[PDB]
């Protein structure tokens, strides 16, 4: 099952939080109505290149509702040290700095 990328803006509903596994859980609210759609999610150390680091734990993160302001959670496996959590694509993408150690 596949979906096209979500096109609208995301917002963090709360501070990203370390899980007991050392991973990071993130909850986002989605302003769009094109759901169901694929949530763009990655981590990077360099926002200019967006070269991926770490990986997404959540297999196929999706917004499942077609109504605005629905929420979803995703889990990320951040790299050693400092990185950025990057949700969404384009100019309206959101970022949050993360430190793992």
């Amino acid at each position: 099952v596949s979906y096209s990328l979500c096109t609208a803006a995301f917002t963090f509903t709360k501070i990203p939080a370390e899980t007991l596994h050392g991973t990071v859980t993130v909850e986002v609210q989605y302003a769009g109505t094109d759901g169901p759609c694929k949530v763009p999610a990655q981590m990077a150390v360099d926002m200019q290149t967006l070269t991926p680091v770490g990986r997404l734990i959540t297999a196929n993160p999706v917004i499942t509702e077609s109504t605005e302001n629905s929420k979803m959670m995703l889990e990320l496996d951040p790299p050693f040290g400092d990185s950025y959590i990057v949700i969404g694509v384009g100019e309206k993408k959101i970022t949050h700095h993360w430190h793992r150690s």
Epitope: L5, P40, A41, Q42, V45, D46, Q48, T49, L50, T51, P52, V53, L56, G81, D82, V89
Partner: single-chain antibody, 230 residues
Framework: MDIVMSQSPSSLAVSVGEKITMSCKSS????????????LAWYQQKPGQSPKLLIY???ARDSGVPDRFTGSGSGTDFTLTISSVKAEDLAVFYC?????????FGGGTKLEIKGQVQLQQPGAELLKPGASVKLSCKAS????????MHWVKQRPGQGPEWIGM????????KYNEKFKNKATLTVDKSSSMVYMQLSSLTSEDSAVFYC?????????WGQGTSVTVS
């Protein structure tokens, strides 16, 4: 496992006005499923100049790049098309993957014709085997602190090699394993200066060393410092 970039043909001799195609193949897919982008760039290096970004995200043209340059392809197979060659296009064209660290470049296609951001680097050094040298990179025209500064090594007419990068604000670094004991990156935040110290110099180190802000719509290269080891 490092990604290997392969280009063909090694050289292309064409007359002005011809349409040409050149190929770039990666050993691993550069299509990142999370955001559906191809992390592939095309660089043009004219005589006497630093490499200049032409295409990023496999098909996005950088500002000022004419429509007659077209990047295409996806995954592991990419193509740069020049619809109508001009004499000024004479250059070596390099593809580069930025899907994974370390960044890697192809061996280049040499195009032969028959028919405010500043990164300032000093002039040539010449040194003896066993010595060390501290190369400098003076940055201006942008907010220095938050942009990664990369260092690149290029032997004559050969594929560039990504040495590593340093973030000035945090001092964080990422090194290519092949240079982890050869190069040391530091910054002087008070002077917007980036340094790369090369140790235990040998003739294998003789090359032009570039500092560069790499990637997408903010790609900028210094003029390079030529280092020759006796």
């Amino acid at each position: 496992m490092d990604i290997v970039m392969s280009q063909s043909p090694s050289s292309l001799a064409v007359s002005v006005g011809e349409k040409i195609t050149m190929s770039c193949k990666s050993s691993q897919s550069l299509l990142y499923s999370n955001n559906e982008k191809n992390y592939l760039a095309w660089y043009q290096q004219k005589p006497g100049q630093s490499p200049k970004l032409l295409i990023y995200w496999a098909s996005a043209r950088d500002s000022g790049v004419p429509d007659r340059f077209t990047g295409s392809g996806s995954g592991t197979d990419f193509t740069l098309t020049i619809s109508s060659v001009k004499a000024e296009d004479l250059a070596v064209f390099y593809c580069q993957q930025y899907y994974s660290y370390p960044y890697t470049f192809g061996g280049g296609t040499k195009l032969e014709i028959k028919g405010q951001v500043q990164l300032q680097q000093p002039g040539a050094e010449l040194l003896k085997p066993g010595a060390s040298v501290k190369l400098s990179c003076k940055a201006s025209g942008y907010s220095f602190s938050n942009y990664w500064m990369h260092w690149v090594k290029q032997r004559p007419g050969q594929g560039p090699e990504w040495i590593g990068m340093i973030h000035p604000n945090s001092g964080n670094t990422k090194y290519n394993e092949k240079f982890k004991n050869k190069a040391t990156l530091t910054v002087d935040k008070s002077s917007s200066m980036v340094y790369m110290q090369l140790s235990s110099l040998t003739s294998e180190d003789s090359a032009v060393f570039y500092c560069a802000r790499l990637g997408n719509d903010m790609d900028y290269w210094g003029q390079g410092t030529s280092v020759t080891v006796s």
